[PDB]
């Protein structure tokens, strides 16, 4: 099968863990007909804990899941552990302030590093999603997200993207 | 639909230069079919393939340093390919790690201005004891792509464990859609195939543009 089955009942869950970056993401994912819930107060341990329980959940009717973490633990989503998401996309957008990764299939991890409209990674990632999110596959979408941050910087930190997606992700 | 996406420059890597670019395939041997397939496919794709068989990792790094130093003005791109062998491990001297650690600086747009805005591809075959983090630290530079898989560095099983699935599939894809298809939907299907054959390929891009060997 070429394409991720992205015509389920529901699109899926968007947990945005933390001001204006959190908002746009929100706007845009909502326009991607995600259900978006926003977690303030940061701390490490809540995020983890929350993610535990979000993995605990019957996702049989969701195209994917999206977990954002915006600054200014995986084993929970593996197919064995989260079989309701197995060969479904599981998207990870981190904006950190050095990290390891492997393993598993259908994972994706967009990762920038921050130092009035906010960070460049988020400005571009939303400028893209919210213009071509439904037109382009995620991996060229995000590629151009790389090009626009590279490139709109200077007038007078690039996203690092790492994908195990076993198919073409289209927001249909 | 990319007809009409650009970005404050352009959509698709300029892949119509005079030459495609170098392929440097380094066999990490200790004390081959993969390494020949690779070779072939990269020749079908128009690369100038040289195949090194060395054993002191430092050799592999330096050989890389000196090719960074070349003028790839007439190059589409470059490809470096490190292949480590199944089920025995290796030893490395005190200054290798560091040396690995550096070797990306050599290729930045600053350090290597004949490849500024050109794809610098890397394929790593590594051991299931090495690390990958962003042991192989993901550089974080524009235009890099590192396709990365782990080879098992110990023993058992009978049907003598084959040529890597990463390489069987990568050659298979490249070798079929290499020219039909853009790199990331290639390396997406290379992932599919080694997963729908049950250590799955871990691709990490900073490509600023759509790469297609046209």
3-class DSSP string for A60-86: CCEEEEEEEEECCCCCCCCCCCCCCCC
**CA-CA-CA-CA torsion sign (A16, A18, A21, A22):** positive
Give the CATH number for residue A141.
3.40.50.1460
User: What DSSP designation does B30 have?
Assistant: -
Label the pairing between strands B144-151 and B202-205.
antiparallel
Please name the helix (run of DSSP H) or strand (run of DSSP E) that holds residue B194, with its range, or none.
helix B183-195
Structure tokens at A145: 């997200």
b/e code A146-158 from CB counts within 10 Å (16+ = b):
bbbbbbeeeeeeb
A96: contact with B, CB 8 A cutoff: no
Q: Report the Cα A139 to chain-centroid distance in Å.
A: 12
Whole-number Cα distances in Å, A133 to A28, A32, A151, A154: 9, 8, 20, 26
Distance CA B7, CA A144 (A): 7
Resolution in A: 2.7
Beta bridge partners of B75: B19
CB proximity list for B94: less than 8 A, separation 6 or greater:
none
CB proximity list for A18: less than 8 A, separation 6 or greater:
A38, A39, A40, A41, A42, A70, A72
Whole-number Cα distances in Å, A71 to A22, A42, A113, A114, B45: 10, 8, 9, 8, 43
Structure tokens at A44: 């490490």
Whole-number Cα distances in Å, B106 to A131, B63, B113, B156: 36, 12, 10, 39
Interchain CB distance below 8 Å, A105 and B204? no
Structure tokens at B193: 């195939």
A159: contact with B, CB 8 A cutoff: yes
Interchain CB distance below 8 Å, A147 and B208? yes
Contact predicate B137/B101, CB 8 Å:
yes
Please name the helix (run of DSSP H) or strand (run of DSSP E) that holds residue B26, with its range, or none.
strand B19-28
Annotated active-site residue A59? The verdict is no
Distance CA B53, CA B56 (A): 10
Which range marks the domain in which residue A51 is found?
Answer: 1-172
Closest CA to B90 of B166, B29, B32, B34: B29
Closest CA to A142 of A110, A105, A94: A110
A166: contact with B, CB 8 A cutoff: yes
Closest CA to B200 of B162, B147, B121: B147
User: What DSSP designation does A159 have?
Assistant: P
Annotated active-site residue B85? The verdict is yes
Structure tokens at A132: 């071509």
B191: contact with A, CB 8 A cutoff: yes
Give the relative orientation of helices B34-44 and B165-177 as an angle to the nearest 10 degrees.
20
Q: Which of B112, B127, B171, B191 is catalytic?
A: B127
Interchain CB distance below 8 Å, B5 and A143? no
Most B CBs within 10 Å, among A133, A138, A147, to test the B interface = A147
Distance CA B147, CA B136 (A): 12
Query: H-type helices in chain A, by residue range?
Result: 20-31, 44-55, 120-132, 138-151
Structure tokens at B112: 């290597």
Contact predicate A63/A5, CB 8 Å:
yes
| Count of domains for chain A | 1
Q: Report the Cα B94 to chain-centroid distance in Å.
A: 25
Interchain CB distance below 8 Å, A105 and B133? no
């Amino acid at each position: 099968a070429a394409e991720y089955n992205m015509r389920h009942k529901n699109r899926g869950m968007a947990l945005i863990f933390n001001n204006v970056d959190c908002e746009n993401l929100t706007r845009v994912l909502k326009q991607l007909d995600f259900e978006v819930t926003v977690y303030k107060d940061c701390r490490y341990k809540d995020i983890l804990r929350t993610i535990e329980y979000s993995a605990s959940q019957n996702h049989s009717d969701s195209d994917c899941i999206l977990v954002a973490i915006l600054s200014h633990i995986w084993s929970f989503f593996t197919a064995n552990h989260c079989p309701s998401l197995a060969g479904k996309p599981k998207l990870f957008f981190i904006q950190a302030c050095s990290y390891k990764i492997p393993v598993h299939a259908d994972f994706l991890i967009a990762y920038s590093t921050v130092p009035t409209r906010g960070s460049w990674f988020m400005q571009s990632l939303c400028a893209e999603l919210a213009a071509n999110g439904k037109r382009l596959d995620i991996l060229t979408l995000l590629t151009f997200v790389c090009q626009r941050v590279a490139v709109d910087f200077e007038s007078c930190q690039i996203p690092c993207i790492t994908t195990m997606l076993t198919r073409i992700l289209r927001f249909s």
